[PDB]
Each structure stands twice: as C-alpha cells, then as structure tokens.
Design a protein around this ligand. Structure first.
Ligand SMILES: [Mg+2]
Ligand SMILES: [Mg+2]
Ligand SMILES: [Mg+2]
Ligand SMILES: [Mg+2]
Ligand SMILES: [Mg+2]
Ligand SMILES: [Mg+2]
Ligand SMILES: [Mg+2]
Ligand SMILES: [Mg+2]
Ligand SMILES: [Mg+2]
Ligand SMILES: [Mg+2]
Ligand SMILES: [Mg+2]
Ligand SMILES: [Mg+2]
Ligand SMILES: [Mg+2]
Ligand SMILES: [Mg+2]
Ligand SMILES: [Mg+2]
Ligand SMILES: [Mg+2]
Ligand SMILES: [Mg+2]
Ligand SMILES: [Mg+2]
Ligand SMILES: [Mg+2]
Ligand SMILES: [Mg+2]
Ligand SMILES: [Mg+2]
Ligand SMILES: [Mg+2]
Ligand SMILES: [Mg+2]
Ligand SMILES: [Mg+2]
Ligand SMILES: [Mg+2]
Ligand SMILES: [Mg+2]
Ligand SMILES: [Mg+2]
Ligand SMILES: [Mg+2]
Lengths: 53, 52, 187, 147, 124, 225
RNA sequence: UGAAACCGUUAAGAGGUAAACGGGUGGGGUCCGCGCAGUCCGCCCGGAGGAUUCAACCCGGCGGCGCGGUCCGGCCGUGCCG
RNA sequence: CCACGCGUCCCCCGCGAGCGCACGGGGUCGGCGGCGAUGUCGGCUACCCACCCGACCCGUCUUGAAACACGGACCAAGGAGUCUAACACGUGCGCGAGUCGGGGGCUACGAAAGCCGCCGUGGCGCAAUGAAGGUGAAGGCCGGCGGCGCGCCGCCGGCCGAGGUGGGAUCCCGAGGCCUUCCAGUCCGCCGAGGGCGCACCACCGGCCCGUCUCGCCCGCCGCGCCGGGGAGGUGGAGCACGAG
RNA sequence: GAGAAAGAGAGUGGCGCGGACGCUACGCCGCGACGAGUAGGAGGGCCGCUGCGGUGAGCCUUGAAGCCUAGGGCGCGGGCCC
C-alpha cells in the first residue's frame, strides 16, 4: 500500500537475512591483529624491505 | 576577539618565570556549546559494547 | 456562543530561531532591539531572516553577488545576505565589494579580500548603519534546491513537467507505459 | 531517542494513533509493491508513469568503463589550471598561449557552456563539442586532440 | 566576552540549582543569590560581592579589578568593614556609587549587608 | 546652562495646553450647534404635518435612513445564506446590535435574516444611550471602551469626527462617512431583555419579536440596556 | 523488608428503597498550629543611661576613572606600507 | 451668552501667581466592638455520619449501549508501534562546487580518540537527452572582399557584450518642511510629494542543448563518398537560462 | 498618551554626596478577543521509571531504598514535598 508520492523500491529482505548477518564488532580487533602480524613480520625479516619485494 | 595576550610560563615553585609565550589563536575560537554537546553525544556512543 | 471558526486562529510564524547556537541568538538579541526601536523596515526583514531555516536561507554565490551589484545606482553600497556568500568559480574578474553576511566561505573571503573589498558581519553592520541606511539586501535562490523539481503537479498527468522519484535513472526505469504513445499512452 | 518519539504521547489513547473504525491490521493492501495494474493503478499512474513495460535494446555484457567520457564546461575550463598561468597569460605580451591538458585533470570531453575569457589557449582533449571548439576558435586558440 | 559566557552559563552552570519552581545560583560574588544576568558575579569585568567576615562580626566587600581578568588570584580585592551598621552601609554606598563601580548593584549590596549585620547582632 | 532650555519646555507645554483648551471649546460649540439642529429636525416634521392637515392633504414623512438590528436567535442550526448575511451585519453572538443605514441593497439583506433579527427605527435617545453605555470602538482591531474623546479623534479625525456627539451625529443624521463611523463602532453587546421577549420564533406582526418593529424598537432597546 | 486482595479482634460512627458516587453544607472525631492577651520595620521627638566616639586633618596601603584636550614605556591586530 | 483689552491697514453693514473642593485614569477609614490556659479558638482539604439536589457500569464494535450484545470474581507482579535497511520531506549542525574516510594504514579508561591527502580509489553532486549509433546547453553591430532584378552576408579585422515585460520586501534620489522674540543663515538628524536601481518568488514572451517531423539552400577536406557540418519553422525531454550539494 | 508626517538639535551674523523594584531578554510587563469535542494531528511538562557522561566539597548507621498512616501541605492535573 504505497502512499502519495515516493520511490517504489525493491528491498532484498524477502529471504531469511537475520540468520546470515555479518556484524563488524571485531573491526578494531582485526586492525590490531593485522598490525601485530605486520610488526612481527617486519621484525622477522630483519634488514629486508618491510613492504616486501 | 582579535587580541592575543602574553601568557606567562610558571616554574615548579609556583611563581612566574621570565618565559612568556603569546596566547595561541585556538583560545579565540568561537565557543559553541551546541557543537560541543552534539559531538560529545555522538562520540560517547562509540566506546560502547553491544548487548542482546 | 460566538459564530467564528478557529481554524486559522493561530498564526504560524516563527518568533525565535530553532537553532540553539549562541552567536546567532546574540544577533537576534541585537536585532530585536534594533527592530522595535527604529522605524527602519530593513531591521524587521533582517530580524525575520535571522529566524529562518537553512532551506529558507539559501547560499548566494559570488557571481550573483557581483551581478546584482553591477546594476546602476547601487555603487559604493554595502550589500547584505543573511545566508552564505559562497564562491563561484566560473567568474574571473571580481570588483571590490562591501559584503555583510553570517558566514562567508573561506575561498570567497580570499577572493573578495584579494580584490580589496571588505567583509562585515552583522554586529559590525549594526555599528556601521543601525537603520540599514545605504544597504542592498539580497537573498539566494530559494527555489534552487532540487526538491522543488519533485513538487507541483504530479507526473503521469498532461502538461506536468515534474521529475518523478526514480531509484536509478536509466532506460528501464519509468520509460515505458505512461511515457510513450507506442506503449499505452503519452502525457 | 525513544524519549522524543511519538509513542510516549500515545500512552493511554486506546487505539495508539491508528483508529477505532479501521484497526491497524497487518497488510491490507498486499505486501510490497503489490497490485500494480489492479488496485493501485491509480497511484502507479498518478505518480510513477512509465513503470510497466519494456523499451529499448538489451545490451548483455555492459561495461561502464568502455563508455567513460566525463565532461567539463568552458566556464570551468580555467579552474583546471592554477591562477598563475592565466595571470601570466594576461600579462604576456608575446602571445604565448597557456597549454591546458584536460585529461590530466580527469575530464575526457570538453563541452562549451559558458563565456570563456578573452585570452588564447591550447586546449588538448580527447573529444570536443562543436560549440566548444568554435568558442575556443572565437577566443583564438587551438583544439589539440589526444588519444 | 560577557554575553556569550552568560548564554553558556545560564542553564549549564554548577552553581545553578533548580527546584520548587525557583531558580538560584550559588556563585560566591552573587548579590540576591539569584540566576540572572545583572547579579551573576563570574562573568563581568566589574563586580561587587558582599560576604560575612572570617571573624564572627564584620562584612567583607569584594571588588573585581579591571586588569587581571584571566588571573583569578590577583583579581578580587577584599576589604573588611567591622563598624557600626550605618557607616558600613555608607561605606558600601560610597564605594559603589562614587567610584562608578557597577551602579546597578548599589542597592542590592546594601540590602545584603543589612541582612548580614542583622544576623551578626545577637539572636532574640 | 538650563535657563532657556528650561523655559521653552513649559512654553511648549503651555502651548499644547492652550491647544487642548481650544479643542474643548470647539467641541462644546459643536455640541450646541447639534442641539439646535436636532430641535429643528424634530419641529419641522411637526410643522409640515400641520401645514398639510391645515389644507386637508397628507404629509408622508421621509422613510428613515437608519435602523438598528439585534440578533435574537442563537448560533445553532443556521442556514448558510442566512448565516453569511448575519456575518456581514456583524451580528455574531446572540443579542448583538448594529446600526445599519437603509437602501435597496440593505433591506433585501435584512429580509433574508428577518426570522433571526429584530430591527426598527431607533430614536435619538436610543442612539445617544447606546453610544454612551454600550458603545466601544474597533481601535487597532482591538476593543477599547470609549472613555475619552481622543480615542474617537485619533481613529476618525480625518472624517471630522472628533468628539462623541460627532459620532452620534454621524450615526443618527446619517452622514457622508457613515460607513467608516459605524464600522468604527464595535457591535453592541446588548444584554438579555428585562421583562422578557414576547415570542422569539414568530414575527412582530403575528405577536412575536422577529422582523421589522418600526417605532417599537426603542421599547426593546430601553430594556436591553 | 513483609505491601494488596481476604480474614480475626479492638475503637469510633452508622444502618428499611443493595452498596457506591458528584455538588453543597452541618454534626462528631482524630491530630496540627507547640495558638490560647498577639505582629513588626525604618525616620523624627522626649526621658534616663553607657562608650574611648563622629566630622575635619596627618601618615601608610589598596582600588576606580574634563581621557594627562596631546605624560612616558610596552604588547597586540581576523590592519596597512616601506 | 465657553463674549471682555489697546494700538495699526482694509472689505461690508505663546511661560500670572497661589491655595482649595471634587459624580474626575478600579477602596479606603488619619472608624470601631467582643472573647480567650485546661476548656476553648482556627484547620477550606483528609476519617466517619446525616440531609437536599443530582446520579444506570466500565472497556468495546456500532447509525445508535445501562442494555435481554460480548470481556471482567478480587488482588500483586509481568504485559503490546520496537530494532535493521531503503526512500521521501521538514528541521538543527559543519563545510561549500564541492563533500564524506564509512574500507585500509600510522601512532585501565581506550574495541575510544587522533592522524593520512600521491590512501579521493569510490559514492553523491557539478549535464542533459536518445531505444541506439550518438550529440551535448545566448547572441548582436560595423568595414572589405523583381550573389543579384546570402536592401538581405559566404569569410575575415574591430566593438558591445549572456535577455525582456508586469508585480515586487528592501533600499537610493529629494518639491518642500519639522517654531521660542524676529530676519539672514551653515552643519547633524528626521518627515515627505514625485521619480529611479529593483532581491527572492510568481505569471507571460523570447533564447540555447538532445530526440523527432517538415521546408530549403550553403559550406569543409588527407581520404570529394550511400562522407561530415550548418540554417528556418513546429513539436517530444525528469534539461540550460550565473550553482546547491 | 499625544486627534494632525516630522528636533524636549547644535552654531554664526542685528551648604547637605542622596534617588524603591527591575532585565533567569527562552526574562518581565501591557492591552483586546476567545475556550465544546470522538477518529486523528501537534505543542509543553520544575509529570513519572531505569541506566550513562557531567555536576551538587549532595544526602546516609545521630538510620538510605522500600512499606503504612484519622498528620501538615503544594500543584488544574500527571505527581511531589514535609
Ligand atoms: Mg494510509
Ligand atoms: Mg464562549
Ligand atoms: Mg474547536
Ligand atoms: Mg490551525
Ligand atoms: Mg483522543
Ligand atoms: Mg496515525
Ligand atoms: Mg475497538
Ligand atoms: Mg485502514
Ligand atoms: Mg469499515
Ligand atoms: Mg502497518
Ligand atoms: Mg482486475
Ligand atoms: Mg434548534
Ligand atoms: Mg424580574
Ligand atoms: Mg519475615
Ligand atoms: Mg461498634
Ligand atoms: Mg433525586
Ligand atoms: Mg466488541
Ligand atoms: Mg466489525
Ligand atoms: Mg448493530
Ligand atoms: Mg462510529
Ligand atoms: Mg434490551
Ligand atoms: Mg448472548
Ligand atoms: Mg465478539
Ligand atoms: Mg463473563
Ligand atoms: Mg511520503
Ligand atoms: Mg532538509
Ligand atoms: Mg550509485
Ligand atoms: Mg478543546
């Protein structure tokens, strides 16, 4: 039942979407994990270029 | 305003030293409690763990 | 019993700005005084335009500033918007201007002060001219927003050139039955 | 903030702002965009004309990178290059026109909308409008192509 | 300045208390102790305050000078008046009136000093 | 110095005091001239009736130029054509009164609202005592009671109506600026009638109170205020 | 901690249109006013008092400003120039 | 009789002093009297009782409920427009033809906060139109060269330059004038006949871009072709017409 | 506050040291007219509950939260203070 005026639109929520949802609360946990892994690699290859080849 | 006074530097004994630095222009920025309250509201919601 | 209707009995205007910043309300505290103790009707228009919304204070650009100043008669006259004097980049020459606005874009400030004009704000305008004597009041394009293209007589209706709300402009998105003589009907 | 929302004023009112005669039922007009040609045809033709039907040629594997050709107008042509070039072009008595590579700024095509100020140019582009190149000729200046 | 920091302080100050449909303000240099613009003592350049003395008797009068605005320790000057009730009030009247020092508070300070001295003369 | 600056203050004050005194003598003699005019207006319609009867003819007096309408039926259940005429007569509440000059454009309005109004030809005493007791003024579209002549004179000075008997003369002797003088007057909030109505619903001819009751509107006014 | 419905008992009051309710008072209670000879506050006059007492001066300190028309020295400019 | 003086020409027949009374811009007394320590005073309200008037039980669906309409014995606690996403508009805030780091990276509270700018990739916006190939948003003036039975320019040199009409808040000008004893007489302020430059917006007429149709002639060259460009007049567009996101 | 567009305007020539309240300008004050309401819409709550950042040199074993009350009260009212 559309009202007076507005976009008629297609939300893709007809599937069961609450079971498959990706919450990003580990975003700063990965932004700590990556830089810990990167510092460990940059210590491990000790004079070599830190970015790689 | 426009004027920048000359803010004295204090030694650890409490009394004033001869060092005397001018007041930076940050301390003449406009005072807006609206913008302060708005940014404090929306940023204190960011250190917040979920509950369900 | 009294035979009057009360439908429009409450008039609908603003009498204070809906904003809560303190500098705008100090400008309001100034022009409340300057509007009731002067006989200048400039101060009432400035007081009424300080109340208005962001959409009722559209930005007046610099190439319309200078264009409405290049009219005859209004030489060495200060000129006042209540909104925002933004820069316009499709203009090269800029005359000297005596602008008075609430907030001028930094690039427009550089552009005007390079040309040698000066930028007042409203607490300086009150000291320079309390009755607004020798000013040119201007305003931006109030129908300049794109939401005044979705308004008016509805689409799908003859002689109504209204932009409809379409989620993505293409050849598949509202081109087919109302829009063509071949398929359905044309309006 | 639910503290500011409508439901805090609608406590005690026994219909909660939806009526006693027509109750707030679940889906009275069908779900979604239902009934386009049947019982909401009046809405979809007073407010979304053209919504039903096919038109035009189907182009299967479309790639939005083949048809990349952004445009710039002549009144913002001089906004590509810094102010010192056009100031020195106005000061130069030689007639040395400044060279403006629009592709370096990121516009492939030059269209001509506005008044262009009267000092020469070498505008090099990937495409040109008819009116744009003749405005460049009318100010007196060259239209260099580049691939 | 003064009118910006009044519009900051006016509803957000720790000296403001609001209950029983009455609004007050507990800054130390306030005369009549009420939240207003004239009477608030933290804001202005020039400011009169009336306090009872550190001794049980006497009235100290606080004057904000004009120079050290941002310097709080050397901003307020104290003067102690341990005298009869008439000359205490004439001293406060001469300090506020004849120094041209913020003359709207000229009667409120005399009311406050008269209320301090009544409490300092002994209880019935 | 404050020597000549002092004395020119009371020079200007004495000047406007003498100006006010000249204005009071003006409106005194205007009221006297009005009393003379009303004596002549009352005696000449007796004089001419006598000189008609002395020959044996008849003297038809002039049809009056001034009626006073009163709304005697309430808000509820009003037909809309009857309603709009009452809104143009400014009879909104029950028991409001309004002076109305007569012509063909107005009598055919009054017969549309004949079931709801009682109107007749108000006497000089009626036009006096309505102004003095219940007469207010639409000043700055507010309702200010006519307590002093300046309230009349500031609004109606440009029509040369500057005391209260000027307003009474313009209403009664219906003048050139009757529209402005009457629309100055707020509609008269008359009380409910002492003694009591005869019958609200039927016309005055058939033993009621609605409709034209020509000379008899004064008996209604005397007990409605 | 120990509420409400419900119940026992004590006290008070009442009772033939089931009870209950709104407006209006009246009567009886129960507690409170810490009622139960009723306010103070300025200025003036008179009468008795008691002070280490006011005004004016002198010294010291502190503060404010017809602005010193224009005193000397600083610092700053979201001012300019060399 | 709300009529009071004198002096000057001619028609006609600008500050007097005091007191006082008040049907005068909303009430005062500069008038009084009683009763008060264990039996009395005040307490409108809240406890009980009495009387007169009034008085059907709530929720609900209904044209209409006290209904012989359904729900409800009573009480305590729990108990129903929430959250995510998209969109629309209105509002407040920052910046502004730009804007935004949301993804990544660098350095207890802090899983925050700061920072990047050769991390603006990217989104939205600054350009539309067409099914599509595509095209893609003012012009005007001068001089020369029945082209002659473009007085209308094909191409160049110079110049003006980015509409008009009506209404329009604001402003700008100012014929005159705002008195103190009178005349001349400057400065400041103010009022104002009349006249302008007209914001936003509205209405209308023009103009430009894209599609389409009709009419018609001219121009371009590396390829003179089933090539390319152009004009005039209608008409279709969610356009432009000195940003507004 | 005054029936009449506008200056309580500047210039040149003939003793006693005194004077209430105010103005949280989102404040205070002054006039006028008005007040019905279901479905619904909107505004204001110094109405109420729970938690969080600030703050009250807040309160509290010399007795907080809760609960009861024929006690004193305030607010139209939600409710609240003794
Ligand atoms: Mg609906
Ligand atoms: Mg009524
Ligand atoms: Mg109503
Ligand atoms: Mg309304
Ligand atoms: Mg309701
Ligand atoms: Mg609703
Ligand atoms: Mg229902
Ligand atoms: Mg429905
Ligand atoms: Mg139905
Ligand atoms: Mg629903
Ligand atoms: Mg069907
Ligand atoms: Mg009836
Ligand atoms: Mg009787
Ligand atoms: Mg137990
Ligand atoms: Mg018993
Ligand atoms: Mg009964
Ligand atoms: Mg039902
Ligand atoms: Mg049903
Ligand atoms: Mg039925
Ligand atoms: Mg119904
Ligand atoms: Mg039945
Ligand atoms: Mg049944
Ligand atoms: Mg049922
Ligand atoms: Mg049942
Ligand atoms: Mg909508
Ligand atoms: Mg908006
Ligand atoms: Mg997109
Ligand atoms: Mg109502």
């Amino acid at each position: 039942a559309p009202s007076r005026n507005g976009m008629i639109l297609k939300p893709h929520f007809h599937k069961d979407w609450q079971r498959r949802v990706a919450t990003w609360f580990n975003q700063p946990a990965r932004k700590i994990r990556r830089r810990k892994a990167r510092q460990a690699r940059a210590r491990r290859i000790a004079p070599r270029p830190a970015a790689g080849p | 305003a426009c004027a920048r006074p000359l803010i004295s530097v204090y030694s650890e004994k409490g009394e004033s030293s001869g060092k005397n630095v001018t007041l930076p222009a940050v301390f003449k920025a406009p005072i807006r409690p609206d913008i302060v309250n708005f940014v404090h509201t929306n940023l204190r919601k960011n250190n917040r763990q979920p509950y369900a | 019993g009294v035979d009057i209707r009360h439908n429009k009995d409450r008039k609908v205007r603003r009498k204070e700005p809906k904003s809560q910043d303190i500098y705008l309300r100090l400008l309001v505290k100034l022009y409340r005084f300057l509007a009731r103790r002067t006989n200048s009707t400039f101060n009432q228009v400035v007081l009424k335009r300080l109340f208005m919304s962001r959409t009722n204070r559209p930005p007046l650009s610099l190439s319309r500033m200078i264009r409405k100043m290049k009219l005859p008669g209004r030489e060495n006259k200060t000129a006042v918007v209540v909104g925002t004097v933004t820069d316009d980049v499709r203009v090269q020459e800029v005359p000297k201007l005596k602008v008075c606005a609430l907030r001028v874009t930094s690039r427009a400030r550089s552009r005007i002060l390079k040309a040698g004009g000066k930028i007042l704000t409203f607490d300086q305008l009150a000291l320079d001219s309390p009755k607004g004597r020798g000013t040119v009041l201007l305003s931006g394009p109030r129908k300049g927003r794109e939401v005044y293209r979705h308004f008016g007589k509805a689409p799908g209706t003859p002689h109504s050139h209204t932009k409809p709300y379409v989620r993505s402009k293409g050849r598949k998105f509202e081109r087919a039955r109302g829009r063509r003589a071949s398929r359905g009907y044309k309006n | 903030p639910s503290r500011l929302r409508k439901t805090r004023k609608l406590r005690g009112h026994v219909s909660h702002g939806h009526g006693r005669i027509g109750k707030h039922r679940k889906h009275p007009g069908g779900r979604g965009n239902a009934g386009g040609m049947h019982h909401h045809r009046i809405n979809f033709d007073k407010y979304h004309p053209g919504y039903f039907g096919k038109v035009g040629m189907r182009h299967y594997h479309l790639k939005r990178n083949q048809s990349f050709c952004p445009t710039v107008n002549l009144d913002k042509l001089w906004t590509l290059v810094s102010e010192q070039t056009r100031v020195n072009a106005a000061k130069n008595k030689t007639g040395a026109a400044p060279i403006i590579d629009v592709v370096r700024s990121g516009y492939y095509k030059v269209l001509g909308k506005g008044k262009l100020p009267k000092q020469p140019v070498i505008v090099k582009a990937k495409f040109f409008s008819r009116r744009a190149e003749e405005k460049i000729k009318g100010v007196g200046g060259a239209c260099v192509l580049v691939a | 300045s003064a009118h910006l920091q009044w519009m900051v302080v006016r509803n957000c100050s720790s000296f403001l208390i609001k209950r029983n449909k009455q609004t007050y303000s507990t800054e130390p240099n306030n005369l009549k102790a009420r939240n207003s613009f004239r009477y608030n003592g933290l804001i202005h350049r020039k400011t009169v305050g009336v306090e009872p003395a550190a001794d049980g008797k006497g009235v100290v009068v606080v004057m904000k000078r004009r120079s050290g605005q941002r310097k709080p320790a050397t901003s307020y000057v104290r003067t102690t008046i341990n005298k009869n009730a008439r000359a205490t009030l004439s001293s406060i009247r001469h300090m506020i009136r004849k120094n041209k020092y913020h003359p709207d508070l000229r009667m409120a300070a005399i009311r406050r000093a008269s209320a301090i001295l009544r409490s300092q003369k002994p209880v019935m | 110095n404050f020597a000549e600056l002092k004395i020119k203050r009371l020079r200007k004050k004495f000047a406007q005091k003498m100006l006010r005194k000249a204005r009071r003598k003006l409106i005194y003699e205007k009221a006297k001239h009005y009393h003379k005019e009303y004596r002549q207006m009352y005696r000449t319609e007796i004089r001419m009736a006598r000189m008609a009867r002395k020959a044996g003819n008849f003297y038809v007096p002039a049809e009056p130029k001034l009626a006073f309408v009163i709304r005697i039926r309430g808000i509820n259940g009003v037909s809309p054509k009857v309603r709009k005429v009452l809104q143009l007569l400014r009879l909104r509440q029950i028991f409001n009164g309004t002076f109305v000059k007569l012509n063909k454009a107005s009598i055919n309005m009054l017969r549309i609202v004949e079931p709801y109004i009682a109107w007749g030809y108000p006497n000089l005493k009626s036009v006096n005592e309505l102004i003095y007791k219940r007469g207010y003024g639409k000043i700055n579209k507010k309702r200010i009671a006519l307590t002093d002549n300046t309230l009349i004179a500031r609004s109606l000075g440009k029509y040369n109506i500057i005391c209260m008997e000027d307003l009474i003369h313009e209403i009664y002797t219906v003048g050139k600026h009757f529209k402005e003088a009457n629309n100055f007057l707020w509609p008269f909030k008359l009380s409910s009638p002492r003694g009591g109505m005869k019958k609200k619903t039927t016309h005055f001819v058939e033993g009621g109170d609605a409709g034209n009751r020509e000379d008899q509107i004064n008996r209604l006014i005397r007990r409605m205020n």
